[PDB]
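Notes, p. 3: input format for complexes.
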Amino acid sequence: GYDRHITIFSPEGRLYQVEYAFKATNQTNINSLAVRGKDCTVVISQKKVPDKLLDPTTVSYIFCISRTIGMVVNGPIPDARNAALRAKAEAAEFRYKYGYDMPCDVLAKRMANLSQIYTQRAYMRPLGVILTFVSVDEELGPSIYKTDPAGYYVGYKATATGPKQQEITTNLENHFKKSKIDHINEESWEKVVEFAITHMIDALGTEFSKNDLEVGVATKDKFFTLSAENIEERLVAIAEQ
Amino acid sequence: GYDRALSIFSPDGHIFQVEYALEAVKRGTCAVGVKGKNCVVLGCERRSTLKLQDTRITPSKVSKIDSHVVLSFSGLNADSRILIEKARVEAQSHRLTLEDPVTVEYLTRYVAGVQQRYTQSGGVRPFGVSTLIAGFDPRDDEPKLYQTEPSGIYSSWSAQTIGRNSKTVREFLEKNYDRKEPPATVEECVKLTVRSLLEVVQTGAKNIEITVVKPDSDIVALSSEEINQYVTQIEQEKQE
Amino acid sequence: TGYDLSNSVFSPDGRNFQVEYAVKAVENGTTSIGIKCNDGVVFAVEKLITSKLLVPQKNVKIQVVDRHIGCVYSGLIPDGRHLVNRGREEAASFKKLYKTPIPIPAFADRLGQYVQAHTLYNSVRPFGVSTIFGGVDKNGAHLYMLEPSGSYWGYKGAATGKGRQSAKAELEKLVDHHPEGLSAREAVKQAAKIIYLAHEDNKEKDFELEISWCSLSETNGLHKFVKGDLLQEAIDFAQKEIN
Amino acid sequence: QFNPYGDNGGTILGIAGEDFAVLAGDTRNITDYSINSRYEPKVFDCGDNIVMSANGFAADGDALVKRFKNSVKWYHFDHNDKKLSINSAARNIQHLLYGKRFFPYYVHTII
Amino acid sequence: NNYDGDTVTFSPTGRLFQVEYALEAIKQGSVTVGLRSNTHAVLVALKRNADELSSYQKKIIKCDEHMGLSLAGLAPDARVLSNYLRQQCNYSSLVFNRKLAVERAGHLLCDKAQKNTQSYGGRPYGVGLLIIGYDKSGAHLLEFQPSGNVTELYGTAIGARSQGAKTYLERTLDTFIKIDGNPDELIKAGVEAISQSLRDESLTVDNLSIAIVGKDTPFTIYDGEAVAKYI
Amino acid sequence: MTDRYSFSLTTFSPSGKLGQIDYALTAVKQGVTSLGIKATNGVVIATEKKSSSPLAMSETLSKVSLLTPDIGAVYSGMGPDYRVLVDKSRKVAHTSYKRIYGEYPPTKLLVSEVAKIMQEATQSGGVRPFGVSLLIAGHDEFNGFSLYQVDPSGSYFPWKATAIGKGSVAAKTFLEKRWNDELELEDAIHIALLTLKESVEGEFNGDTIELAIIGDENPDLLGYTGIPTDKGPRFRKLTSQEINDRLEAL
Amino acid sequence: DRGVSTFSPEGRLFQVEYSLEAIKLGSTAIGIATKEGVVLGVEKRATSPLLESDSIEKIVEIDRHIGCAMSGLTADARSMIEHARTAAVTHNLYYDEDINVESLTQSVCDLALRFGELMSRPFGVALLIAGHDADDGYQLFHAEPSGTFYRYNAKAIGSGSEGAQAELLNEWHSSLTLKEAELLVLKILKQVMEEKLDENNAQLSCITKQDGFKIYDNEKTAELIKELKEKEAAE
Amino acid sequence: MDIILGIRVQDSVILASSKAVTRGISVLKDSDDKTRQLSPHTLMSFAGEAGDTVQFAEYIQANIQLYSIREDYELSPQAVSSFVRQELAKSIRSRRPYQVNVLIGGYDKKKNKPELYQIDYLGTKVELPYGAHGYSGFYTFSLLDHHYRPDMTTEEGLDLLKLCVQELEKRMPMDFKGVIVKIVDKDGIRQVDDF
Amino acid sequence: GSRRYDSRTTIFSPEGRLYQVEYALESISHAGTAIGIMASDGIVLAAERKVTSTLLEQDTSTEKLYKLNDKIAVAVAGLTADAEILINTARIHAQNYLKTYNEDIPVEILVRRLSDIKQGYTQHGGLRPFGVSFIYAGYDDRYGYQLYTSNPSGNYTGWKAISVGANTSAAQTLLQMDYKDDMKVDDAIELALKTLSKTTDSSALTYDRLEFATIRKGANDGEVYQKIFKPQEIKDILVKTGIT
Ligand SMILES: [Cl-]
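Output follows (1990 residues plus chloride ion):
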């Protein structure tokens, strides 16, 4: 049964190493969520600092790839950082060669094509991560694009990733079934973050403090992550209505 | 590159890939070499499972390496072409740098060296081929007959056979070949070579090929009718 | 089964068993710790005295990278040396191009990406070391700990090796009892104590304490070994606390 | 254009006696009309009772002497501390010099 | 068991079996002893013969005028490592006009041995080395193991029955460290140490190999009738 | 840090089977149904947009891809493998043809180059075969309209009509009954939508169906005017609206 | 399968130990070093009576002052001999002198462990390298495929080696003459050979300071065999 | 190497090639054969830079002889000339080109026709009734333009060749020490030993 | 490391056979039958297509018969994709020979070259062999009309008539029964089709199943013509010989 050790076809037509890379995705036991506003794209993720000896400022699964692009990872941190460094390098090289900032969807495709190679070439293992890229693209507007160990990638109106992704996904599905639009009809990003946090609370059934969350916001011409105090302001507003 | 060590030692001190190459030689059609006093004759079996063959264009079993040296073989046919090509190139390269054609011993030593190299190089299997190399050295009237084999060992033979049922024809030659007085003429040498093949071949003259090599680059391949005359004369004497 | 025989193979769990086996080599090694203080970091290590024939203060385990980063590790000592040699090349090439000495978070990822790269192929073995390292840069003090998987995080206190649970418990007290922070000279003393307390797990053989430190006030932000009187003051403090 | 060669002057002299030999050299080192040093040794003990000097361009001379001295050291390692005979040394130096046949050591060597 | 097919595979308890098997080749090798004072360092090596017709395998190799080692295990691997040391000692001399520090020599051997333990295809070195030297910080003795672990010591022994010599040195530590400015007495202590690791056979003239380096003593090897003095 | 897989991962088993190619074909069988129908004045290729989530924007995931202005491709099997093949196919059409001859390759030769890439994954060291079957529809001046199928083996066959993937056996039987050599392009599109409805479970509309044609030259889609030798791409992907119009006359 | 350069649990290279088994299957080769010269002798072991036994070259010249005998897979020795000859001639070119027998042997033995995944397996042949130089006099070395070489006063390798080595144990002393050593090699060969010893299935050679390395004529060896038979019948 | 002539007559090709080998001041040899037999019915004369000439000729000889053994067949003179041209055409764009001009005289046993090819160091091939390289042609082509006929016998070809050599001996400054003449016909290659 | 997963494609069995070559020959035995028949005035290549579907566009299809140059054609049995790799190499060797010698490549030289490539894959490189058997039909001015076959081992042989692919045992017996040396192209055409008609695993032999070709020295004024038969022409020759 060496068809389960390397990336070759089993008799069923399956790549077991790709399937087991997908299982490594949930090893962190973290849930992420991404939604789009009018002018923005918000990505939130659970932050779990189990050890008191850890410096909580360094515990992050959100990455600033370029000025415009942000990336959240569901999976182990070494593979997440492998993917982050490569995406940064690709985004920089793209700008140098072609004279404009790499679009979110194009980076997602590029990383997906790299992931595909690991599923076809035997000496390379797949990375055990799901990469969710976010930006406010200058042509396409607010954008969410997600890549996985299979090399699959697709755009999203909103998305969720993690152990409890199905609960978050159905929660979001139901909201957009009501509103009948592809986005959160909201002017300020601050309120889109409040929406994201609120709908994760409802879906997961857990309350959050400022140190339980990690938030990334993409606007036109910059992507930035919120501090604990910025999140606290968000949590205060949610509680007050 | 593919670097994998295919020829390796086993616990009993055997290199199985080299020994399994000898089994490919055992499967090959019989080939025999008999040296007379002023000639060498290379006899070869042609298996009669293959009729409807075109004998004009089919690869002949005996190959000229230079105008004065020949090479027959037993084993994998495709493998033999690689050795023959390298040997032919080396024969011209020797003429080019030494201003003298190869000796039969030198050409043998080269071919044997190539065979050896494939038994301890990564990524390659041994040649499934044993050769009989025969001829005359330049400006020399002493006949030469050598044998190589997959391991890369080589040696000189008064007469020798290789291939399938080579045990039987070596038995024949061991009793019928006298060293003190070898086949004095071309006729006697060819006759002894045909006789020895007739122990194994079990058919008339289409299955036997004979090539006579004489001093000073005088190589000639016998036709079916010329060989068929020897086959007729042997069996008529045998009926007694 | 057979998923643990080759590096870079995902088991059906989603685990790389060869990396988890490298962790067992780390857990088997001697205790080593790191303490982040106000304006720097302190590193310390348990050195088991196998025999009386070992020369004291000679078999140095803590290694310096550039002039400002200290590295200490537990597990297969040569693997640690290999990783530091790489770190030195990374720190050198960074300084060559960008002039400034390598920042500690930047340096941490350079080791991190390299260690992670040894979990991507079956033709290499994972590192058999958890590495505690850090120093002072332009953004202040930083302490890191880096595992066989390539995983690393920033720490207030860090500990690895056979006496890690013992050490971790002691570090967790210091974090609770000093929220405003610990001084560099305090951290040296506490480091000595923690290695002494963590020696109960390796209690058969006696040991040799080795401490180093980077501190903006005490060492001008450079890595230095704690030597002579300051080392003996810390050994005395540690010997007093166990009794 | 960069000229890789120079002339550091000096002069050397070898004379072979019956049961002895001498190798003499002046200690002046120059460039153009300037004295660099009044005492810069040019004749060296290379071990194994061999003395050597490579007069001409001092950088190539030092390089050669350095390489020959090292050759003596490695001759000991590789051949069980065997003494390098003067004839063997000479042949070894020929190979050192000819190794740079197309970018020569600009020196006249005596041992 | 299943995890000893190559050097690149950890066992489930975090062990590298190929390294441990290389370590085993040292234990099968003949005994050699190292010890030092503040002025001198001494190698004493029991050489092994194939039979009575054969020569006794040389155990001691010179690396520079101020450094050398004794081997126990695969002699070809000792040759590779000693040659590597010779080059590094030589590089230090040629480039920096500097004799290579003995501690730094050990670091280089460690790192060379390590690369063979982490990469596929290669094997660990199957030899243990005792390096002695005299540098700018006095006399030194190192023990190299092919795992990569190098250790500075006052005295030690490696090879078959080396635990007998190692215990003796552990007792004698306070005596032999003080043998300053007296090479013959330091060698005596080494010859008396290696005697503890002997069974059946005793130290004959072509059996024993001794080397010494010190303050005003280049690394020099003594074999044959040169060591008859110490038997 | 070495690629040590310099040996084939696809080899002949005792029965004469190339296991990995057969298994690649099994992966293609699990894939969503796609089909191709050749008319007299065009070719149509079609497939179901199987949406992995309703939050996903299925417009972004193009299963039907332009290779050259006159050649289009669709697949069944593993989407990522298809995506990288389209990238190589587009590039090879330039490097090995357009940069030499100054014109795009004919359908059969581009197919041959794609087939070659897929064959090499079937024999080269350290790679598995591609887990897709492609349907390549195209037009060129001297061969006219054509439709090719390309398998994981590298084998390719020209078709009048065919289907691959999930419900291909049923779909091929359906096409055999309906196909004739006098079909107009509109008739073929109609048949394509009928055939594809059988294999589709859920919603059946312009948003869940991807459909393109190789047909007449589209000078409106060219983007420039003033060059009479360039009359515009024959490849055209039908819009969500254009599909829904034909579904009313179904 | 398993690595070519793998260690066994006892601390030995599998492939090296298995190549030693191949050498045991080889024909016998005996070397005896004396103060008058070194004698090398070999069993030829022709596989058939039609094989011209003078073409069996198991004793070989490396230089005028260095000879070599082989046992095992003798085809493997050709590249080792080639390297030795090149090493001997190259050293004479660089240093205007004969090369030491130990240095030559060391050069050959450096090839031995250049195998892995360089050549694909160790050599399947052991060499007795006999010679003379001005520093250490007459020398006999046994060069294995492990990369190790031992100097010997006398040595037997091949199929009859342990039986022959025990015989060499008793018989060798430091005052042996060259003529005595010749007969002793012939004596021990005749003991361990399957077929009866004569000038056509056994070969002698020697290396002396004056005449250098010489393979003996079959006529010369035939006289030494006849001299041996008479001296054994004599008591 | 100085003068190499070639003349194709009815049933044979005749190659004349000078015997002098001069290195600067002195004539080192006066009996040099500037030709190689490539195959039994194909002869190649050559002239050009020292060293290059022979190295090239012998290199071509080895390749044609190798072909002959491999296929047990003699390449046509046309095929041999095309091989040679390509080697020279490859050579001219090398790091160091072969400075060698050649004439290839051959008898095509299939067509029963003599053939003469003239190829220069650039790889400029031409089939001719008569050819020359270097300064020879300046004197000899006008002669051959006058006196040549395609149906000439071998003896008439040799008389015409004497007239060429006499003219070169009269009007050229260098003493080329006479010529070695060789005839290529259906029976093979032979040397005219008195000329 | 990687060694674990290496099939070792280039090794001998204990019996002295090359595993992968033997299994490739087993693969080829399931491929559609191809027949070559050499006459005094031409060669016939006949071959059976494997994938009978009514929707297969037969007139633009080529799975069996390929053109190497103007004088030489091949019939393929095995993996089509593998054959096309070798065909494009063979096409290049022919044009390299033409460029070098200014003469068309002799048939045997081209065959040997391809056969040497196939051999290489069995002796080194660690790759699987090409799962292809060729029948080479060709003409040159040395030997005239020639038939050869090569197989995955890299061994090649010359023939008067030969089959490769499926049911070669049955096919070779039928050819051996009805072939004669004085035979002509029109007779060989009939023999080829009759042989396929009996050995076919199908219920009946039709035009849509066949690829057919002839190399004649029956062109205008003593040249050689390669005719790859169109679907309609295969249908005509089936009615002419009396099979449909
Ligand atoms: Cl890409």
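Chains D and H do not touch (no CB pair under 8 Å).
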